[PDB]
Structures are given as structure tokens and as C-alpha cells.
């Protein structure tokens, strides 16, 4: 029942990192090949990656053009070769809505200047493939005042920690003492995959 | 027109002998892949070579269900992979009736047997793919009495001959004489490709 050639593709999920959304799903193809579509929850179907073997399909193109609307991928499975083909199988993804869904990845210290008896720290801003007009949007253009660094700090018992909704951070600093310092992103307001990994750790010396 | 992604199948040529039949195209596919059809001339069209990266396809299985018939070929040609895909692009392929086009494969003698002062020679009766219930049928069960052979033989200025419309030769040999021999196979009524090349030669010693 559906099909003497052909296997319906399972366990479909979204791998995603600052915006950057590939599909991955199972099983390796035997005698057949995949064609992934993609659509808003309730949109019209649009034809992605076609007729492959592969068991992942780069979306990204697609889920920025409104990082806010909520998507759903649909993977149809082919006969392929010299065959006796007896509505061809298919299966849904889960829902992705990359404004929520999407990884924060790990930080980045750009760098840090003393300056008499303050530390300025910056933080990274990345690029992502999100367009507005013809640029493309670093990920603190992306989320605004949504996007908050944690900067963690100690000389060598305990770190002291500053916050802000922007990539520095102007902290005063003991005489005397070298620093390390290290970085985190959130998104307070999301209920899921809140926080980044720590950023590499960074000293002063 | 015509996509920026795919390109049309050119060159369509059918591959036959002894009823095993292959339709070869052009070109080798950049970012594409074909799928090959087949129909009776005025038929309906099924699908055989699915979402292929070859460019060639066994008709064999189709053809030989009536080898009188005249068959179309066409080849689809369908974007693959990861891409813009901007009514496919396809091609037609000659006109094929089996039973008047397939070439006759080289021949070979099965034996030869004097007895006294005369010689028989025995013509291998080939298998082939077209059934006939639950059976394959030789290639003198197809042509039946359409299929001819010459018999060529000499022993060592020129060649006598004889000729049958069955797999066996009675002939007279001169005595005290080595006699060498060699069939090829003709279908007189045929206006195209009549005959077979010579069988290699065999000889009495």
C-alpha cells in the first residue's frame, strides 16, 4: 500500500543556526530520490530540491524572506532507474517559525581596549543571509533590542556579570589585575531556545 | 524558453538486435536528470526510466509485449537538485517497429556431423526476451519462416552455397576433403536491414 518501489521519508527535522535552516530526513534512499517543498503553514507548495539523493535540502533562501511567518517542508519520494512503478508517498516536517526556533550560535569576543581604568569588551555581530533591499542583515539587525549579550568577567572565586542590547560592554576594572571575560547571547522573551553556548574565553595580559 | 535549468534531449537513436532493445540520447546531464516513456505509436504513454542520470534506457520489456507494433520514445528532461526551476522540456524519438528493425545478430554454427559422404551443419538457435505464455521464444520462433540462412562452404577459388529456412543443412562433400563453412541470416522481406554478418568459420579437420 503505496507503492512497490518506494519508502516515505520519516523522522524530518530542522537543523537551524542563525538563520542558516536545512532539512534533514531519513532513510537513505534505495532506488529512489527525494523532492522537498516548501510553504507558509497554510500557503501555497514550492519546489525546492529536486529529485535528489540526498537526505537534506539547505532552505535558508526560503524562511528569511519573512523570518516571523511559520513554515512546513513536505518530502515526496520518486522512483528511480529502470523500474515498475506500481499520488506518490510523502510526509510533512514539523512546523518552523526561524524568528523563535532558530540557534543562537556561539559568540565571539571582537575585542577589548582599556582605557585608563575601564574595559570596553565588543562582541561579534555576525552576518546572515536575511536581505532588506540589497544587504544583507548581521543578527543584532535581525532581533533589535530582542537580542541581549551577558558578559561574564573575573580576575583569577566568582565572575561578576554586566548585560546589554548592544554588541560593548564599558565595565571598570581593578588596578593591577588581568582580566578573562567571556560572552553569552539570549533572547529573554523566547520560551525555547533561549541562550547561545558561552563564547571562547578571552584575557587580558 | 524552456527553462534556465533544463536542456532538451537531442540525438534519440534505438539500439536492437535480437529483439534486446536500448533508446540511447544526448547529452550527458548537468544538474538534470530524464525520465523515458514509451507508446505505441497512436497509445497511450507509461513511464519506464524514472528521474535517471544515464543516457540510455531498456525498452526490451515493452517492445517484445507485440513486436509487430511501432513504438515512441520520449525523454523528459527535469531539474535536479537544489535549485530555481524557472509544461518540461522533452523529445520524441524515432518511430521503432521491432519485428521489421531489429538487427540480426551474428550467427553460429552449433556442429557439424558427416555421415558417409555427406555433411550437416546445425545453426545456433538463439534464445530471446519475447514470451509467449510462460516461455521465451527463439528467434526462429519469432520469424518463423521470414528467417533464411545461407550455408557457405569450400574446401581449399569460391564458395558454393546453399540455403534453409530451418537450422540445419544436408549437403554432399567431395570426398577426401576438409571442408570449412561459415551461415549468415536473411529475412528477403525485409526492405532494411536484411541480413546479419557472416558467422565466424568452422571447419571439418
Known amino acids: 500500500s503505496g507503492t512497490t518501489n518506494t519508502v516515505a521519508a520519516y523522522n524530518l527535522t530542522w537543523k537551524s543556526t542563525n ?21 507558509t503553514k497554510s500557503g501555497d507548495w514550492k519546489s525546492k530540491c529536486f529529485y535528489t539523493t540526498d537526505t537534506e535540502c539547505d532552505l535558508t533562501d526560503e524562511i528569511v524572506k519573512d523570518v516571523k511567518q511559520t513554515y512546513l517542508a513536505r518530502v515526496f519520494s ?27 550560535g556561539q559568540p565571539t569576543i571582537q575585542s577589548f ?22 544587504t544583507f542583515l548581521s543578527l543584532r539587525d535581525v532581533f533589535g533590542k530582542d537580542l541581549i549579550y551577558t558578559l561574564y568577567y573575573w580576575k583569577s572565586s566568582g565572575k561578576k556579570t554586566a548585560k ?41 595580559g
Chains 1, 2 share one sequence.
Open 113 to 134: 581596549e582599556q582605557v585608563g581604568t575601564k574595559v570596553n569588551v565588543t562582541v561579534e555581530d555576525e552576518r546572515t543571509l536575511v536581505r532588506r533591499n540589497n
Open 19 to 39: 538563520f542558516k535552516t536545512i532539512l534533514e530526513w531519513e532513510p537513505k534512499p534505495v532506488n529512489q530520490v527525494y523532492t522537498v517543498q516548501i510553504s
Open 78 to 104: 520518486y522512483p528511480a532507474g529502470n523500474v515498475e512503478s506500481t499520488e506518490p508517498l510523502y510526509e510533512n516536517s514539523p512546523e518552523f517559525t526561524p524568528y523563535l526556533e532558530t540557534n543562537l
Open 164 to 204: 546589554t542590547n548592544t554588541n560593548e560592554f564599558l565595565i571598570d576594572v581593578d588596578k593591577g589585575e588581568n582580566y578573562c571575560f567571556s560572552v553569552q547571547a539570549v533572547i529573554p522573551s523566547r520560551t525555547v531556545n533561549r541562550k547561545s553556548t558561552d563564547s571562547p574565553v578571552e584575557c587580558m
